[PDB]
Amino acid sequence: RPAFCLEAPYAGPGAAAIIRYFYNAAAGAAQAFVYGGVAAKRNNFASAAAALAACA
């Protein structure tokens, strides 16, 4: 499992309210989070499926 899959989700400083997915390693699950539209980190995916494919 890539190390970035352990990062906490990062909304960043933007003002958009975009639904994105992160891998929650403790939950063994991809979960939705709000991304502000800038300054993304790597644990940040378009869908649950893309999160799981990278990290599960």
Residue numbers in the entry: 1001 to 1056
The authors write:
We mutated the exposed and partially exposed residues (P8, K15, R17, R39, K41, R42, and D50) to alanines because we expected that these substitutions would minimally affect the densely packed interior of the native protein45. The mutants were named according to the numbers of alanines in their sequences (i.e. BPTI-19A stands for a BPTI variant containing 19 Alanines) and a suffix ‘a’ or ‘b’ was added to distinguish variants containing the same numbers of alanines at different sites45. To provide a structural view of this peculiar instance of enthalpy stabilization, we crystallized and solved the structures of six simplified BPTI variants containing 19, 20, 21, 22, 23, and 24 alanines. On the other hand, despite repeated trials, BPTI variants containing 25–27 alanines merely formed needle crystals, unsuitable for diffraction. All six variants crystallized under the same conditions, indicating a minimal disturbance of the surface properties, even upon multiple alanine substitutions. X-ray crystallographic analyses indicated that all of the simplified BPTI structures fully overlapped and that the main change that occurred upon the number of alanines was an increase in the solvent content in the asymmetric units. The new water molecules were recruited around the alanine substitution sites and were involved in novel hydration networks. Thus, favorable protein–water interactions appear to be the most likely factor responsible for the increased unfolding enthalpy of the simplified BPTIs, rather than the relaxation of atomic clashes or the creation of new intramolecular hydrogen bonds or van der Waals contacts, assuming that the hydration structures remain the same for all alanine mutants in their denatured states. Finally, it is noteworthy that a protein in which more than 40% of the residues are alanines can fold into a native-like, well packed structure that can be crystallized and solved at high resolution.
